[PDB]
Scaffold this active site. Structure first.
Site, short mmCIF file in Angstrom:
data_model
loop_
_atom_site.label_atom_id
_atom_site.label_comp_id
_atom_site.label_asym_id
_atom_site.label_seq_id
_atom_site.Cartn_x
_atom_site.Cartn_y
_atom_site.Cartn_z
N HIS A 38 -10.60 35.55 -7.42
CA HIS A 38 -10.56 37.05 -7.80
C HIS A 38 -9.81 37.88 -6.88
CE1 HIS A 38 -14.22 36.84 -4.93
NE2 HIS A 38 -13.97 38.15 -5.02
N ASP A 55 -14.29 29.91 -9.32
CA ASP A 55 -13.72 31.09 -8.81
C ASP A 55 -13.12 30.95 -7.52
OD1 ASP A 55 -13.01 33.90 -8.88
OD2 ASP A 55 -14.87 34.46 -7.72
N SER A 107 -14.76 40.42 0.32
CA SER A 107 -14.56 39.14 -0.44
C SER A 107 -13.95 38.25 0.24
CB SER A 107 -14.10 39.28 -1.94
OG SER A 107 -15.00 39.95 -2.80
#
Lengths: 149, 149
Positions: A27, A49, A101
């Site tokens: 992502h 992911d 992230s």
């Protein structure tokens, strides 16, 4: 071992040299801010992911060995100490924001334990949404109402 | 005067500003890591394994001269002192490795005397394989069994 993904000159997440692969959350927008790493060919995996590639021989000495071993207690991350219990990583609400992230959650021996993807605010504390290793295979824990950082 | 040829973000060889041309071995993969130099139009020459172009006016002050004049004795190069005799440049074996091509061999007045292309190991010393100027024209001396650096 940690390298930063940049997008339009802005840090979006991180990339990590674990085992013999080079990881970075799928992502995360941008490209690894490192020539050698940026020119690689990554294999995306939407289930996890995850988005891995292989570490160039000249950096393989720079990898970090991860772990499925995570006993209830406190873990380490850039902004402080994460807390693990009930099969959930949490932190004091406010200590993690969008743009965090990719940041790994290490233990006290340096083994990466999970990789932050975002967090769900549940008051005093925020339950993190992470990518974590199972018996051997990757997994993703996403608390109800997570806000993807 | 020395500029590095990069390929997939990795130094393959070198490029040199000698006389009024911009040189770089033809066999070297990559493109000169310098805007002004990279956008030039080079003329390949497979006989000489050379690939020259002309130095932009704003860098011509940055060239390095040359000379056909090379009397037996010692010359200077980045790793130490080269020795010339019997029409052959040599160095202590080990002092020149792959990735040293393009490096000039200066004399004591700074005049570039030859440009290293590779070397043949003949024991104690290695006979260099160089590009050298004759009466006026370029030439290439390659000792038997050279290993192209």
């Amino acid at each position: 071992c940690i390298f930063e993904v940049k997008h339009e000159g802005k840090v979006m997440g991180y990339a990590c040299l674990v085992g013999d692969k080079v990881m970075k959350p799928a992502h995360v927008k941008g490209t690894i801010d490192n020539a050698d790493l940026a020119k690689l060919a990554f294999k995306r995996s939407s289930k996890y992911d995850l988005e891995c590639a292989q570490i160039p021989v000249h950096m393989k000495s720079d990898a970090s060995k991860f772990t499925h071993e995570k006993p209830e207690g406190y873990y380490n991350w850039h902004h402080g100490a994460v807390q693990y219990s009930g099969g959930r990583f949490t932190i004091p609400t406010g200590a993690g924001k969008p743009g965090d992230s990719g940041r790994p959650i290490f233990d006290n021996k340096g083994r990466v334990v999970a990789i932050v993807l975002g967090g769900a605010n549940e008051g005093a504390r925020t339950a993190l949404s992470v990518v974590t290793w199972n018996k051997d295979i990757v997994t993703k824990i996403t608390p109800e109402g997570a806000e993807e950082w």
